[PDB]
């Protein structure tokens, strides 16, 4: 029983972590905050921030470092590009994902009860993807030879975006294809359920 991950249900943040933890084929338990005690919760993560990653001696839940730490903790297989010019780019991309994209999900998660304010938020998101379906052709996985964190960031996104209503069709082109073979991966497939 080496390292356990505690995960709240709805989090897009908790999905993308169980993906990256799969690609590493590391035996790590998976627990639900909502299946434990209001006492232990305060012991594993005082600020109540899920998901959390416990080890014999360590503990971590920083949104920005959680995944980057999984990729370094269990090193093989690397979830960052090998070529330097591709790694430097892929980082600046994760940052865009977290900071320009995840906000769009939280917003669609908070003003979710307002149908007038959803239909218009969707219209702006679907409109933006299609202004990028152009730079999606020419790679099996996102802007890369193999699987990156960028794919874990984006699986969890599409997946939680789906549950919030927003779906992806044939209208998106490369994106739909990419989204379909992203869902194909065994690592994404597990956390999905």
């Amino acid at each position: 029983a080496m390292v356990t991950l505690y995960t709240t249900k709805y989090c897009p943040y908790s999905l993308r972590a169980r993906i990256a933890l799969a690609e590493k084929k590391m035996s790590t338990d998976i627990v639900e905050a909502g299946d434990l005690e209001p006492a232990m919760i305060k012991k594993i993560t005082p600020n109540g921030v899920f998901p959390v990653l416990m080890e014999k001696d360590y503990s971590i839940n920083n949104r920005k470092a959680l995944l980057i730490y999984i990729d370094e903790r269990f090193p093989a297989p690397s979830l960052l590009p090998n070529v330097v010019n591709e790694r430097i780019k892929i980082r600046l991309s994760l940052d865009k994902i977290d900071n320009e994209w995840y906000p769009v999900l939280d917003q669609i998660r908070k003003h979710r009860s307002d149908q007038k304010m959803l239909e218009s938020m969707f219209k702006d998101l679907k409109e933006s993807l299609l202004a990028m379906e152009k730079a999606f052709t020419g790679s099996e996985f996102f802007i890369s030879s193999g699987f990156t964190l960028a794919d874990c960031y984006i699986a969890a996104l599409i997946i939680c975006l789906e549950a919030e209503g927003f779906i992806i069709d044939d209208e998106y082109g490369a994106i739909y294809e990419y989204k379909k073979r992203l869902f194909a991966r065994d690592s994404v497939k597990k956390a999905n359920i």
Binding site: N62, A65, V84, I88, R91, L92
Partner: protein, 204 residues
Amino acid sequence: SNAMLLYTKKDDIYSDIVRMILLIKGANAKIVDVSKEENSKHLEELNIITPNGNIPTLSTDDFAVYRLSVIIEAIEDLYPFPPMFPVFPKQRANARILLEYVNKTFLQNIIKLQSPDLDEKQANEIKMLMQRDIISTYKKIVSEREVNAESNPDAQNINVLTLIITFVFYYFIKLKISIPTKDKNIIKEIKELLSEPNFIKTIK
């Protein structure tokens, strides 16, 4: 190839920080003060390769990257020697979580303070918020560096979070903000930090 152009501005704390990292590595760094009128043609270039003229930007023929975590890691990709980060993943994560706090609380605020249309009351709440933590923060940067040095005496790496906290000080002095402590020892250290050769080569 190695046409590394580092777009910076004057008195921008992030540029000064990056410039001393490139200096530490040895990077062939064609610096570009986009604050000078002369470089008007470069700032034209920059508003094209980045979305909001992001300063500083580290560009080559291959990429154009902004954000400070990005750049710092980029530099470590392009110039492994000598090592900026620790080696144990836990210690690396911590340096990253700390660097986030130092950026939100100090760097980001140091910038808000350079805004000419700032309320004199708001600007005073910033200046104070900073004093309030600068010390406790400093300690953490230390405790952490102490661990990362011993757990590997043969590795001998440069603490990036001590390098940054040094510039936070310089900019305290620079903004007439006061470093609230009477610890004669702490004071001894903050003087040493500003007394390091690579630091005096940068601001010069």
